[PDB]
PDB file of all heavy atoms in Angstrom:
ATOM      1  N   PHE R 138      85.999 117.883-209.729  1.00 34.85           N
ATOM      2  CA  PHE R 138      87.150 117.060-210.044  1.00 34.85           C
ATOM      3  C   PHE R 138      88.427 117.851-209.803  1.00 34.85           C
ATOM      4  O   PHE R 138      88.432 119.089-209.736  1.00 34.85           O
ATOM      5  CB  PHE R 138      87.094 116.524-211.482  1.00 34.85           C
ATOM      6  CG  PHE R 138      87.425 117.542-212.538  1.00 34.85           C
ATOM      7  CD1 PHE R 138      88.651 117.523-213.182  1.00 34.85           C
ATOM      8  CD2 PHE R 138      86.498 118.490-212.915  1.00 34.85           C
ATOM      9  CE1 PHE R 138      88.945 118.445-214.161  1.00 34.85           C
ATOM     10  CE2 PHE R 138      86.789 119.408-213.899  1.00 34.85           C
ATOM     11  CZ  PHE R 138      88.016 119.390-214.516  1.00 34.85           C
ATOM     12  N   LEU R 139      89.519 117.097-209.697  1.00 36.24           N
ATOM     13  CA  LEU R 139      90.783 117.583-209.167  1.00 36.24           C
ATOM     14  C   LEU R 139      91.904 117.221-210.127  1.00 36.24           C
ATOM     15  O   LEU R 139      92.017 116.061-210.522  1.00 36.24           O
ATOM     16  CB  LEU R 139      91.038 116.951-207.798  1.00 36.24           C
ATOM     17  CG  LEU R 139      92.239 117.417-207.002  1.00 36.24           C
ATOM     18  CD1 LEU R 139      91.876 118.747-206.445  1.00 36.24           C
ATOM     19  CD2 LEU R 139      92.541 116.440-205.889  1.00 36.24           C
ATOM     20  N   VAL R 140      92.737 118.193-210.490  1.00 37.45           N
ATOM     21  CA  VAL R 140      93.809 118.002-211.460  1.00 37.45           C
ATOM     22  C   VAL R 140      95.132 118.259-210.759  1.00 37.45           C
ATOM     23  O   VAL R 140      95.353 119.359-210.230  1.00 37.45           O
ATOM     24  CB  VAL R 140      93.655 118.931-212.672  1.00 37.45           C
ATOM     25  CG1 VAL R 140      94.899 118.899-213.538  1.00 37.45           C
ATOM     26  CG2 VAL R 140      92.456 118.534-213.473  1.00 37.45           C
ATOM     27  N   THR R 141      96.007 117.253-210.765  1.00 39.62           N
ATOM     28  CA  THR R 141      97.324 117.371-210.157  1.00 39.62           C
ATOM     29  C   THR R 141      98.355 117.783-211.207  1.00 39.62           C
ATOM     30  O   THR R 141      98.021 118.098-212.350  1.00 39.62           O
ATOM     31  CB  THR R 141      97.729 116.062-209.486  1.00 39.62           C
ATOM     32  OG1 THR R 141      98.217 115.147-210.474  1.00 39.62           O
ATOM     33  CG2 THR R 141      96.547 115.442-208.770  1.00 39.62           C
ATOM     34  N   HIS R 142      99.631 117.783-210.820  1.00 37.07           N
ATOM     35  CA  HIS R 142     100.721 118.080-211.741  1.00 37.07           C
ATOM     36  C   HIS R 142     101.122 116.885-212.594  1.00 37.07           C
ATOM     37  O   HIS R 142     101.839 117.062-213.584  1.00 37.07           O
ATOM     38  CB  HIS R 142     101.942 118.586-210.967  1.00 37.07           C
ATOM     39  CG  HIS R 142     102.768 117.495-210.363  1.00 37.07           C
ATOM     40  ND1 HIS R 142     102.243 116.559-209.499  1.00 37.07           N
ATOM     41  CD2 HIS R 142     104.082 117.196-210.488  1.00 37.07           C
ATOM     42  CE1 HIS R 142     103.196 115.724-209.126  1.00 37.07           C
ATOM     43  NE2 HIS R 142     104.321 116.089-209.711  1.00 37.07           N
ATOM     44  N   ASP R 143     100.672 115.681-212.239  1.00 35.78           N
ATOM     45  CA  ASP R 143     100.842 114.472-213.041  1.00 35.78           C
ATOM     46  C   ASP R 143      99.728 114.339-214.089  1.00 35.78           C
ATOM     47  O   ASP R 143      99.640 113.320-214.785  1.00 35.78           O
ATOM     48  CB  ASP R 143     100.888 113.258-212.089  1.00 35.78           C
ATOM     49  CG  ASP R 143     101.320 111.958-212.768  1.00 35.78           C
ATOM     50  OD1 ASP R 143     102.112 112.019-213.727  1.00 35.78           O
ATOM     51  OD2 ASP R 143     100.857 110.873-212.364  1.00 35.78           O
ATOM     52  N   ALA R 144      98.890 115.381-214.217  1.00 35.02           N
ATOM     53  CA  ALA R 144      97.651 115.406-215.007  1.00 35.02           C
ATOM     54  C   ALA R 144      96.694 114.292-214.600  1.00 35.02           C
ATOM     55  O   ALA R 144      95.882 113.827-215.399  1.00 35.02           O
ATOM     56  CB  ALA R 144      97.919 115.377-216.516  1.00 35.02           C
ATOM     57  N   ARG R 145      96.774 113.864-213.343  1.00 35.10           N
ATOM     58  CA  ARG R 145      95.792 112.954-212.783  1.00 35.10           C
ATOM     59  C   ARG R 145      94.568 113.763-212.400  1.00 35.10           C
ATOM     60  O   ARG R 145      94.678 114.767-211.683  1.00 35.10           O
ATOM     61  CB  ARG R 145      96.355 112.221-211.570  1.00 35.10           C
ATOM     62  CG  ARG R 145      97.615 111.433-211.859  1.00 35.10           C
ATOM     63  CD  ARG R 145      97.856 110.382-210.792  1.00 35.10           C
ATOM     64  NE  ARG R 145      96.922 109.270-210.913  1.00 35.10           N
ATOM     65  CZ  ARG R 145      97.155 108.182-211.636  1.00 35.10           C
ATOM     66  NH1 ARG R 145      98.296 108.064-212.300  1.00 35.10           N
ATOM     67  NH2 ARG R 145      96.247 107.218-211.697  1.00 35.10           N
ATOM     68  N   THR R 146      93.414 113.360-212.916  1.00 33.33           N
ATOM     69  CA  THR R 146      92.153 113.930-212.487  1.00 33.33           C
ATOM     70  C   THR R 146      91.436 112.930-211.600  1.00 33.33           C
ATOM     71  O   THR R 146      91.218 111.777-211.979  1.00 33.33           O
ATOM     72  CB  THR R 146      91.273 114.305-213.676  1.00 33.33           C
ATOM     73  OG1 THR R 146      90.628 113.134-214.185  1.00 33.33           O
ATOM     74  CG2 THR R 146      92.112 114.932-214.760  1.00 33.33           C
ATOM     75  N   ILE R 147      91.087 113.388-210.409  1.00 32.93           N
ATOM     76  CA  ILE R 147      90.379 112.591-209.424  1.00 32.93           C
ATOM     77  C   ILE R 147      88.961 113.121-209.344  1.00 32.93           C
ATOM     78  O   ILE R 147      88.750 114.322-209.135  1.00 32.93           O
ATOM     79  CB  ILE R 147      91.058 112.634-208.044  1.00 32.93           C
ATOM     80  CG1 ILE R 147      92.522 112.215-208.156  1.00 32.93           C
ATOM     81  CG2 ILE R 147      90.327 111.728-207.082  1.00 32.93           C
ATOM     82  CD1 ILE R 147      93.496 113.364-208.024  1.00 32.93           C
ATOM     83  N   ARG R 148      88.001 112.236-209.558  1.00 29.88           N
ATOM     84  CA  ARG R 148      86.593 112.557-209.454  1.00 29.88           C
ATOM     85  C   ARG R 148      86.157 112.428-207.999  1.00 29.88           C
ATOM     86  O   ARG R 148      86.598 111.520-207.288  1.00 29.88           O
ATOM     87  CB  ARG R 148      85.793 111.618-210.359  1.00 29.88           C
ATOM     88  CG  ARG R 148      84.338 111.942-210.499  1.00 29.88           C
ATOM     89  CD  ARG R 148      83.624 110.905-211.330  1.00 29.88           C
ATOM     90  NE  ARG R 148      83.971 111.019-212.738  1.00 29.88           N
ATOM     91  CZ  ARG R 148      83.210 111.622-213.644  1.00 29.88           C
ATOM     92  NH1 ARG R 148      82.053 112.159-213.287  1.00 29.88           N
ATOM     93  NH2 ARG R 148      83.601 111.682-214.908  1.00 29.88           N
ATOM     94  N   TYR R 149      85.286 113.357-207.563  1.00 25.55           N
ATOM     95  CA  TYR R 149      84.752 113.472-206.205  1.00 25.55           C
ATOM     96  C   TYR R 149      85.855 113.542-205.151  1.00 25.55           C
ATOM     97  O   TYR R 149      86.082 112.560-204.431  1.00 25.55           O
ATOM     98  CB  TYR R 149      83.816 112.302-205.885  1.00 25.55           C
ATOM     99  CG  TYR R 149      82.528 112.248-206.681  1.00 25.55           C
ATOM    100  CD1 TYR R 149      82.313 111.246-207.614  1.00 25.55           C
ATOM    101  CD2 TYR R 149      81.520 113.176-206.480  1.00 25.55           C
ATOM    102  CE1 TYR R 149      81.138 111.178-208.337  1.00 25.55           C
ATOM    103  CE2 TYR R 149      80.331 113.109-207.189  1.00 25.55           C
ATOM    104  CZ  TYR R 149      80.155 112.113-208.123  1.00 25.55           C
ATOM    105  OH  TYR R 149      78.985 112.042-208.841  1.00 25.55           O
ATOM    106  N   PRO R 150      86.568 114.667-205.028  1.00 23.62           N
ATOM    107  CA  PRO R 150      87.658 114.746-204.049  1.00 23.62           C
ATOM    108  C   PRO R 150      87.167 115.109-202.658  1.00 23.62           C
ATOM    109  O   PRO R 150      85.960 115.202-202.430  1.00 23.62           O
ATOM    110  CB  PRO R 150      88.541 115.851-204.628  1.00 23.62           C
ATOM    111  CG  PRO R 150      87.546 116.794-205.205  1.00 23.62           C
ATOM    112  CD  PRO R 150      86.382 115.956-205.713  1.00 23.62           C
ATOM    113  N   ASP R 151      88.088 115.311-201.720  1.00 19.40           N
ATOM    114  CA  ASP R 151      87.711 115.883-200.437  1.00 19.40           C
ATOM    115  C   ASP R 151      87.513 117.391-200.587  1.00 19.40           C
ATOM    116  O   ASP R 151      88.329 118.064-201.222  1.00 19.40           O
ATOM    117  CB  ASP R 151      88.771 115.589-199.382  1.00 19.40           C
ATOM    118  CG  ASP R 151      88.841 114.121-199.027  1.00 19.40           C
ATOM    119  OD1 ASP R 151      88.489 113.291-199.889  1.00 19.40           O
ATOM    120  OD2 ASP R 151      89.248 113.796-197.890  1.00 19.40           O
ATOM    121  N   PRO R 152      86.452 117.952-200.006  1.00 22.93           N
ATOM    122  CA  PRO R 152      86.029 119.308-200.388  1.00 22.93           C
ATOM    123  C   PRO R 152      86.844 120.460-199.812  1.00 22.93           C
ATOM    124  O   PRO R 152      86.453 121.618-199.980  1.00 22.93           O
ATOM    125  CB  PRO R 152      84.585 119.363-199.880  1.00 22.93           C
ATOM    126  CG  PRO R 152      84.568 118.422-198.731  1.00 22.93           C
ATOM    127  CD  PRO R 152      85.489 117.304-199.100  1.00 22.93           C
ATOM    128  N   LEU R 153      87.960 120.183-199.139  1.00 22.22           N
ATOM    129  CA  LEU R 153      88.855 121.244-198.700  1.00 22.22           C
ATOM    130  C   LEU R 153      90.139 121.292-199.516  1.00 22.22           C
ATOM    131  O   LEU R 153      90.881 122.276-199.424  1.00 22.22           O
ATOM    132  CB  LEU R 153      89.185 121.090-197.199  1.00 22.22           C
ATOM    133  CG  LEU R 153      89.895 122.215-196.416  1.00 22.22           C
ATOM    134  CD1 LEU R 153      89.284 123.565-196.759  1.00 22.22           C
ATOM    135  CD2 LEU R 153      89.909 122.003-194.915  1.00 22.22           C
ATOM    136  N   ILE R 154      90.393 120.297-200.362  1.00 21.42           N
ATOM    137  CA  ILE R 154      91.646 120.241-201.101  1.00 21.42           C
ATOM    138  C   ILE R 154      91.612 121.275-202.213  1.00 21.42           C
ATOM    139  O   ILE R 154      91.094 121.021-203.304  1.00 21.42           O
ATOM    140  CB  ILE R 154      91.901 118.835-201.659  1.00 21.42           C
ATOM    141  CG1 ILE R 154      91.634 117.788-200.575  1.00 21.42           C
ATOM    142  CG2 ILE R 154      93.319 118.742-202.170  1.00 21.42           C
ATOM    143  CD1 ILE R 154      92.043 116.384-200.946  1.00 21.42           C
ATOM    144  N   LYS R 155      92.162 122.447-201.934  1.00 22.39           N
ATOM    145  CA  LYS R 155      92.129 123.572-202.853  1.00 22.39           C
ATOM    146  C   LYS R 155      93.394 123.563-203.708  1.00 22.39           C
ATOM    147  O   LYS R 155      94.119 122.565-203.757  1.00 22.39           O
ATOM    148  CB  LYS R 155      91.959 124.875-202.071  1.00 22.39           C
ATOM    149  CG  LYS R 155      90.657 124.975-201.287  1.00 22.39           C
ATOM    150  CD  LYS R 155      89.454 124.614-202.145  1.00 22.39           C
ATOM    151  CE  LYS R 155      88.163 124.676-201.348  1.00 22.39           C
ATOM    152  NZ  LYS R 155      86.981 124.338-202.189  1.00 22.39           N
ATOM    153  N   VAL R 156      93.652 124.670-204.406  1.00 18.87           N
ATOM    154  CA  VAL R 156      94.850 124.808-205.224  1.00 18.87           C
ATOM    155  C   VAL R 156      96.087 124.845-204.329  1.00 18.87           C
ATOM    156  O   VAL R 156      96.042 125.292-203.175  1.00 18.87           O
ATOM    157  CB  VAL R 156      94.739 126.072-206.095  1.00 18.87           C
ATOM    158  CG1 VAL R 156      95.715 126.045-207.261  1.00 18.87           C
ATOM    159  CG2 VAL R 156      93.316 126.239-206.603  1.00 18.87           C
ATOM    160  N   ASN R 157      97.193 124.308-204.864  1.00 17.73           N
ATOM    161  CA  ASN R 157      98.517 124.261-204.231  1.00 17.73           C
ATOM    162  C   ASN R 157      98.507 123.450-202.940  1.00 17.73           C
ATOM    163  O   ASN R 157      99.283 123.712-202.021  1.00 17.73           O
ATOM    164  CB  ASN R 157      99.085 125.664-203.993  1.00 17.73           C
ATOM    165  CG  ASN R 157      99.094 126.499-205.248  1.00 17.73           C
ATOM    166  OD1 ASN R 157      99.610 126.081-206.280  1.00 17.73           O
ATOM    167  ND2 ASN R 157      98.508 127.684-205.173  1.00 17.73           N
ATOM    168  N   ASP R 158      97.640 122.447-202.868  1.00 17.92           N
ATOM    169  CA  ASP R 158      97.628 121.497-201.761  1.00 17.92           C
ATOM    170  C   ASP R 158      98.183 120.203-202.335  1.00 17.92           C
ATOM    171  O   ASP R 158      97.992 119.921-203.517  1.00 17.92           O
ATOM    172  CB  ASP R 158      96.225 121.294-201.209  1.00 17.92           C
ATOM    173  CG  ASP R 158      95.865 122.312-200.155  1.00 17.92           C
ATOM    174  OD1 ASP R 158      96.587 123.324-200.041  1.00 17.92           O
ATOM    175  OD2 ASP R 158      94.869 122.093-199.431  1.00 17.92           O
ATOM    176  N   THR R 159      98.855 119.403-201.521  1.00 15.82           N
ATOM    177  CA  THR R 159      99.353 118.153-202.072  1.00 15.82           C
ATOM    178  C   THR R 159      98.577 116.973-201.512  1.00 15.82           C
ATOM    179  O   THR R 159      97.974 117.043-200.446  1.00 15.82           O
ATOM    180  CB  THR R 159     100.843 118.001-201.808  1.00 15.82           C
ATOM    181  OG1 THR R 159     101.074 117.859-200.403  1.00 15.82           O
ATOM    182  CG2 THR R 159     101.576 119.206-202.331  1.00 15.82           C
ATOM    183  N   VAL R 160      98.600 115.874-202.257  1.00 13.96           N
ATOM    184  CA  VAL R 160      97.686 114.758-202.057  1.00 13.96           C
ATOM    185  C   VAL R 160      98.490 113.465-202.086  1.00 13.96           C
ATOM    186  O   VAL R 160      99.379 113.303-202.931  1.00 13.96           O
ATOM    187  CB  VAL R 160      96.583 114.760-203.138  1.00 13.96           C
ATOM    188  CG1 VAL R 160      95.943 113.403-203.294  1.00 13.96           C
ATOM    189  CG2 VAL R 160      95.526 115.799-202.817  1.00 13.96           C
ATOM    190  N   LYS R 161      98.215 112.572-201.137  1.00 13.26           N
ATOM    191  CA  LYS R 161      98.760 111.217-201.124  1.00 13.26           C
ATOM    192  C   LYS R 161      97.857 110.335-201.985  1.00 13.26           C
ATOM    193  O   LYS R 161      96.809 109.860-201.548  1.00 13.26           O
ATOM    194  CB  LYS R 161      98.853 110.708-199.693  1.00 13.26           C
ATOM    195  CG  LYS R 161      99.738 109.503-199.507  1.00 13.26           C
ATOM    196  CD  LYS R 161      99.882 109.159-198.037  1.00 13.26           C
ATOM    197  CE  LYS R 161     100.093 107.673-197.839  1.00 13.26           C
ATOM    198  NZ  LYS R 161      99.150 106.866-198.651  1.00 13.26           N
ATOM    199  N   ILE R 162      98.262 110.124-203.235  1.00 14.14           N
ATOM    200  CA  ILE R 162      97.507 109.304-204.170  1.00 14.14           C
ATOM    201  C   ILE R 162      97.852 107.839-203.938  1.00 14.14           C
ATOM    202  O   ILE R 162      99.031 107.465-203.824  1.00 14.14           O
ATOM    203  CB  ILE R 162      97.774 109.723-205.630  1.00 14.14           C
ATOM    204  CG1 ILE R 162      97.323 111.159-205.907  1.00 14.14           C
ATOM    205  CG2 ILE R 162      97.063 108.816-206.623  1.00 14.14           C
ATOM    206  CD1 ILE R 162      98.427 112.177-205.907  1.00 14.14           C
ATOM    207  N   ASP R 163      96.796 107.008-203.894  1.00 12.45           N
ATOM    208  CA  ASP R 163      96.858 105.597-203.538  1.00 12.45           C
ATOM    209  C   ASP R 163      97.705 104.757-204.485  1.00 12.45           C
ATOM    210  O   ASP R 163      98.308 103.779-204.042  1.00 12.45           O
ATOM    211  CB  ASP R 163      95.443 105.015-203.513  1.00 12.45           C
ATOM    212  CG  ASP R 163      95.369 103.669-202.828  1.00 12.45           C
ATOM    213  OD1 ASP R 163      96.315 103.300-202.105  1.00 12.45           O
ATOM    214  OD2 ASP R 163      94.337 102.988-202.985  1.00 12.45           O
ATOM    215  N   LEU R 164      97.656 105.037-205.791  1.00 14.83           N
ATOM    216  CA  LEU R 164      98.423 104.371-206.853  1.00 14.83           C
ATOM    217  C   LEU R 164      98.128 102.883-207.072  1.00 14.83           C
ATOM    218  O   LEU R 164      98.704 102.273-207.978  1.00 14.83           O
ATOM    219  CB  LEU R 164      99.931 104.530-206.643  1.00 14.83           C
ATOM    220  CG  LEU R 164     100.600 105.884-206.806  1.00 14.83           C
ATOM    221  CD1 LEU R 164     102.092 105.670-206.660  1.00 14.83           C
ATOM    222  CD2 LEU R 164     100.261 106.483-208.147  1.00 14.83           C
TER     223      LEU R 164
END
């Protein structure tokens, strides 16, 4: 799982998205 700065946790992410990477969240 993946924790952003919005405290959004995403279950089952893409397996290269490491720390300090940014993500286009669908919303």
Side-chain angles (χ1 to χ4, degrees):
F138 76 105
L139 186 76
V140 170
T141 80
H142 81 304
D143 191 31
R145 302 199 73 91
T146 80
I147 305 106
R148 188 184 287 260
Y149 294 111
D151 292 27
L153 191 44
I154 314 188
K155 298 311 178 179
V156 198
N157 307 307
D158 273 14
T159 66
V160 159
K161 196 174 150 314
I162 297 101
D163 194 16
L164 291 185

